[PDB]
PDB file of C-alpha atoms and ligand atoms in Angstrom:
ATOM      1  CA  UNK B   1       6.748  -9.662   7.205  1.00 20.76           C
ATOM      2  CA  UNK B   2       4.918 -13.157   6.963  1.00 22.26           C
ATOM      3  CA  UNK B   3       4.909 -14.978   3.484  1.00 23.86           C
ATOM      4  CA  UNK B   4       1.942 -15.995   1.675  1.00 22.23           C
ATOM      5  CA  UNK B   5       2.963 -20.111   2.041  1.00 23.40           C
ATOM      6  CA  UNK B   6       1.162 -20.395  -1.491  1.00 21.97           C
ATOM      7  CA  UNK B   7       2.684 -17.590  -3.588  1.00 19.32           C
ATOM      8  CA  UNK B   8       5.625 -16.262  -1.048  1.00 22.85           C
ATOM      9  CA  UNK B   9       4.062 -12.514  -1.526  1.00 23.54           C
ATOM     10  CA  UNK B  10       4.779 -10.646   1.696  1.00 25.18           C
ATOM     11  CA  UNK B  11       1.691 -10.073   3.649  1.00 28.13           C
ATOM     12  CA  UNK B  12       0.544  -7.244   5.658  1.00 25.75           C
ATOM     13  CA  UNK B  13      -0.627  -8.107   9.728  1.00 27.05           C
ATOM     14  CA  UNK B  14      -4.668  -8.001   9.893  1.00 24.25           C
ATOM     15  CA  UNK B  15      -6.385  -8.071  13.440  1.00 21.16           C
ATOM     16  CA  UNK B  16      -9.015 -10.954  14.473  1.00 22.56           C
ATOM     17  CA  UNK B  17     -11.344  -7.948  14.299  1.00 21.84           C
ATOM     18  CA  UNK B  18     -10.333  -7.528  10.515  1.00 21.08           C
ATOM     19  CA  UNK B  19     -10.483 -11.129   9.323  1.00 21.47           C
ATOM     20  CA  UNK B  20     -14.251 -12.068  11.482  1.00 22.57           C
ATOM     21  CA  UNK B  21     -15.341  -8.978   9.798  1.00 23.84           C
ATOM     22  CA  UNK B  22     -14.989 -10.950   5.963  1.00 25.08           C
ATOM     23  CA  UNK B  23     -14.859 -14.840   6.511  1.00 24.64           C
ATOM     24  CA  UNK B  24     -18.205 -17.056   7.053  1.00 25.52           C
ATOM     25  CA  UNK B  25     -19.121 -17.269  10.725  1.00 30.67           C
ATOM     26  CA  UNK B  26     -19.000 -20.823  10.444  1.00 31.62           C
ATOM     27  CA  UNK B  27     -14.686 -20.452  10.569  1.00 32.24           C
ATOM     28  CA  UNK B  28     -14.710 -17.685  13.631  1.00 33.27           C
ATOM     29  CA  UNK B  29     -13.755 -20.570  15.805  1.00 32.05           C
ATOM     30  CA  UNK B  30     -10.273 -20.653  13.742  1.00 29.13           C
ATOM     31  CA  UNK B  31      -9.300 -17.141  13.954  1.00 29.94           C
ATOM     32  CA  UNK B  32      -7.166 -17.412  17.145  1.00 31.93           C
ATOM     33  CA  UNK B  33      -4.840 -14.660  16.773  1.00 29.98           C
ATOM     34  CA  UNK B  34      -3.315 -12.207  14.214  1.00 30.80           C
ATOM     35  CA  UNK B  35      -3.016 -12.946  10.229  1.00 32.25           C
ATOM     36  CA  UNK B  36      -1.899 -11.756   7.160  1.00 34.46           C
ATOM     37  CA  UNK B  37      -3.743 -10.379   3.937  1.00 34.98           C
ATOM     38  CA  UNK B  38      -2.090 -11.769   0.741  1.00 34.20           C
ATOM     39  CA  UNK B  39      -2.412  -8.950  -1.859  1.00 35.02           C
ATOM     40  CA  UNK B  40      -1.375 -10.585  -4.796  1.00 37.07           C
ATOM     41  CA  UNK B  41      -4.226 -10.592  -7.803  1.00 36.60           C
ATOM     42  CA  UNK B  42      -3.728 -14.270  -9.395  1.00 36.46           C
ATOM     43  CA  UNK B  43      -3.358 -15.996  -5.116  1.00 35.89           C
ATOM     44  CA  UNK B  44      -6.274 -18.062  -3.837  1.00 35.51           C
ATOM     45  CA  UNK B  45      -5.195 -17.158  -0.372  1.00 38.53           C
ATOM     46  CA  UNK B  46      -6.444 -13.509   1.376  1.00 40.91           C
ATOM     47  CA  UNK B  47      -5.543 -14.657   4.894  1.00 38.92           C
ATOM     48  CA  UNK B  48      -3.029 -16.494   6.387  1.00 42.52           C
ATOM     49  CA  UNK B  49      -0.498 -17.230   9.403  1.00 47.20           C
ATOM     50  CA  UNK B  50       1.086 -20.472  11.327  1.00 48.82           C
ATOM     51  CA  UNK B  51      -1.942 -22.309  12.163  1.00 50.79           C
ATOM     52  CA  UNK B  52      -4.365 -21.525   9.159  1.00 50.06           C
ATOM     53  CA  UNK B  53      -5.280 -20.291   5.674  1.00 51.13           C
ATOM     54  CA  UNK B  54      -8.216 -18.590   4.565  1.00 53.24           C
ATOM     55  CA  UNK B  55      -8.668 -18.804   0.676  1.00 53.99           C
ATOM     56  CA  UNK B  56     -10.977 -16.779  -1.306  1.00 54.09           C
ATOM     57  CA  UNK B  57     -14.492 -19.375  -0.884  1.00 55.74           C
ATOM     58  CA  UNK B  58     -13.879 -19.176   2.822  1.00 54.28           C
ATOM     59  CA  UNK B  59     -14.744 -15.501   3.111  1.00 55.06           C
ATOM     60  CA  UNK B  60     -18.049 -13.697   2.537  1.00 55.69           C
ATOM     61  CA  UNK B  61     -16.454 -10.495   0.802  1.00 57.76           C
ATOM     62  CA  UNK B  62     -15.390  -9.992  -2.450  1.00 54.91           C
ATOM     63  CA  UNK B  63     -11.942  -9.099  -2.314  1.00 54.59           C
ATOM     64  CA  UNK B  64     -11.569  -6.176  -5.406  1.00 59.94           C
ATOM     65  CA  UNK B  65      -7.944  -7.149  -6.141  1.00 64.32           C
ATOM     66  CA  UNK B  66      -8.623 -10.937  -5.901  1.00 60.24           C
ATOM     67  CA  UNK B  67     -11.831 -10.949  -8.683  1.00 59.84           C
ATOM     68  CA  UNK B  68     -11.579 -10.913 -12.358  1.00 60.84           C
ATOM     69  CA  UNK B  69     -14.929  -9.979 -13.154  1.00 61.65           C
ATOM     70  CA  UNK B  70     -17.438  -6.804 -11.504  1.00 61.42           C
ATOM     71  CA  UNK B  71     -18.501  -6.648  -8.899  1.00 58.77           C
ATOM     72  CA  UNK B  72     -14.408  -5.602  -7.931  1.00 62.10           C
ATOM     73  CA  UNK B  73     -14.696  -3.715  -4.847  1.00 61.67           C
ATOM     74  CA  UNK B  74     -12.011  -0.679  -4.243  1.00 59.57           C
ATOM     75  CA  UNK B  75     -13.251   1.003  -1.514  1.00 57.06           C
ATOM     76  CA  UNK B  76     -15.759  -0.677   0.908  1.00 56.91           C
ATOM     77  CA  UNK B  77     -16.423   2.275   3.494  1.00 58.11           C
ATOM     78  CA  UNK B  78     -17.763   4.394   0.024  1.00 58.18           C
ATOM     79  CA  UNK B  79     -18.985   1.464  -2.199  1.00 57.69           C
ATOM     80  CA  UNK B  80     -17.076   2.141  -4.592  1.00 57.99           C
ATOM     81  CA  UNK B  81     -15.839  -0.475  -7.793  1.00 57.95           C
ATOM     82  CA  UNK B  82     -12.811  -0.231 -10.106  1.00 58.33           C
ATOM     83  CA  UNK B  83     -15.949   0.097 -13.013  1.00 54.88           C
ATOM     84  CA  UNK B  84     -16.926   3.499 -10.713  1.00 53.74           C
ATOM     85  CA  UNK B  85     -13.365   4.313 -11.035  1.00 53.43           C
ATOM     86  CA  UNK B  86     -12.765   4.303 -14.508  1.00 53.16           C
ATOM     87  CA  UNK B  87     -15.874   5.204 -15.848  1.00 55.51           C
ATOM     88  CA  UNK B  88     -15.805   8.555 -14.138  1.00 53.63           C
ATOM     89  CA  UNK B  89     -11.704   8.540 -15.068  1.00 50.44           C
ATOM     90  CA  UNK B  90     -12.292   8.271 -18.637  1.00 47.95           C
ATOM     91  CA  UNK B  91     -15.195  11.655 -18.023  1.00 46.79           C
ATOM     92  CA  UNK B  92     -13.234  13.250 -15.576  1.00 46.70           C
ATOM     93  CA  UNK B  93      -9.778  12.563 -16.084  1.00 45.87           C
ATOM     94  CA  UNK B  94      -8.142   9.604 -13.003  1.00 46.39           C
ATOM     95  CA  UNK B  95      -7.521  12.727 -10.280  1.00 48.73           C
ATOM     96  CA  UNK B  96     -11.316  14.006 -10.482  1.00 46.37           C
ATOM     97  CA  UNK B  97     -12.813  10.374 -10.423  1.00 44.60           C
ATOM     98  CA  UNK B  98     -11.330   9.718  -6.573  1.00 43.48           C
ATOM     99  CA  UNK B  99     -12.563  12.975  -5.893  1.00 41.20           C
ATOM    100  CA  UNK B 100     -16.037  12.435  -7.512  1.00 42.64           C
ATOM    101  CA  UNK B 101     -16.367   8.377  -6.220  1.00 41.94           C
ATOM    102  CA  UNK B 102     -15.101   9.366  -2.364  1.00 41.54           C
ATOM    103  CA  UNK B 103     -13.009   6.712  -3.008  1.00 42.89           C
ATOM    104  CA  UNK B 104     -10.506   6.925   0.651  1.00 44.22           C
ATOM    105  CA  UNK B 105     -12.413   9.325   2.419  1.00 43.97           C
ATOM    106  CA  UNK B 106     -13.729   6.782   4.801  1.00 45.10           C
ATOM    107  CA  UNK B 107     -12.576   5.678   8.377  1.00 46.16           C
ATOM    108  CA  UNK B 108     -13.552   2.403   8.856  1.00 44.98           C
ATOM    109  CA  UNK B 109     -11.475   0.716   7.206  1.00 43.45           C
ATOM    110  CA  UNK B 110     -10.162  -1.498   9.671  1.00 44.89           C
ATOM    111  CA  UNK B 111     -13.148  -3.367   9.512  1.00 43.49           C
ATOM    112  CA  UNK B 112     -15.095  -2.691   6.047  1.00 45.14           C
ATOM    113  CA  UNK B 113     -11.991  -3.113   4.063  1.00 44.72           C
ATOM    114  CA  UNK B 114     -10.685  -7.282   4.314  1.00 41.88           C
ATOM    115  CA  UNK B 115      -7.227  -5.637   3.777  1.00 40.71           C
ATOM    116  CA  UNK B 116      -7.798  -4.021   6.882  1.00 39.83           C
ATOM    117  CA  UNK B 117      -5.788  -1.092   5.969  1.00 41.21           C
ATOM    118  CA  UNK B 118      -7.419   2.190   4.173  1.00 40.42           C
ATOM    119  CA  UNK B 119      -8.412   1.465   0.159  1.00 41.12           C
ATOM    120  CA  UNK B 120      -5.455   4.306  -0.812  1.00 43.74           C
ATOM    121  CA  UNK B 121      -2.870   0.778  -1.753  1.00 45.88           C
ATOM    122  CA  UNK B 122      -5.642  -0.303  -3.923  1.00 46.17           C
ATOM    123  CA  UNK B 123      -6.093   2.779  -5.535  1.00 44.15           C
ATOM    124  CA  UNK B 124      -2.192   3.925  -5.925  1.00 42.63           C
ATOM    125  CA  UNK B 125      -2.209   0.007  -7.792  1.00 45.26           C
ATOM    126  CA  UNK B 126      -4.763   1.072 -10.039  1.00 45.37           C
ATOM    127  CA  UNK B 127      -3.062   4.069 -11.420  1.00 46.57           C
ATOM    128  CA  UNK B 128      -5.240   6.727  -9.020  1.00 44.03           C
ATOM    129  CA  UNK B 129      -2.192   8.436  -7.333  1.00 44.10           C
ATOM    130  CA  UNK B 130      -4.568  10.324  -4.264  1.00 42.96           C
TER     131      UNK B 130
HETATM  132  S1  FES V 201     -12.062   1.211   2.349  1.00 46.62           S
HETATM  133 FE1  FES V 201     -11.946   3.183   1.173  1.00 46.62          FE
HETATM  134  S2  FES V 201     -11.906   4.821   2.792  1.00 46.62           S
HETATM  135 FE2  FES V 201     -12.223   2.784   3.933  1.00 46.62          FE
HETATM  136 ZN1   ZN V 202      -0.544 -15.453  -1.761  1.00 46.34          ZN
END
């Protein structure tokens, strides 16, 4: 509902739970309330709300849809990376590789994931409908 103030993307609400879980303990003292995960690839930012932004160097995880280069996390409750993906895609065809990676079959999302949410948006981007 909130937009990214750097690249006006639409962000989706992420708990304090969510965001201590990925930025350096050193910023926990700034996380005073609910933010929002900016999704967009080519956007610095991964958190943000009124008081504060989080960019990319201020978090300890790799976010998967922020890198350009492996390691590119997808999901983080399975350890699984887009080159796990489409590896087993190009073997097994894109519907066999989620099934073969147990890519989404996770619950812990809220916290493993720094999108907070469960790693099916990632997936559905990258062309694995689940
Ligand atoms: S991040 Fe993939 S099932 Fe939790
Ligand atoms: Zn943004």
């Amino acid at each position: 509902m909130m937009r990214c103030p750097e690249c006006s993307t639409e962000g989706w609400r992420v708990l304090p739970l969510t965001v201590g879980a990925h930025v350096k303990e050193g910023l926990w003292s700034k996380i005073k309330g609910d933010f929002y995960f900016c999704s967009l690839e080519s956007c610095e930012v991964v958190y943000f709300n009124e008081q504060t932004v989080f960019r990319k160097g201020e978090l300890k995880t790799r976010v998967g849809v922020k890198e350009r280069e492996e390691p590119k996390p997808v999901c983080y409750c399975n350890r699984v990376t887009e080159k796990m993906l489409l590896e087993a895609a190009e073997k097994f065809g894109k519907e066999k590789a989620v099934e073969i990676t147990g890519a989404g079959k996770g619950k812990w999302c809220v916290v493993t994931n720094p999108s907070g949410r469960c790693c099916h948006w990632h997936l559905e981007r990258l062309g694995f409908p689940v």
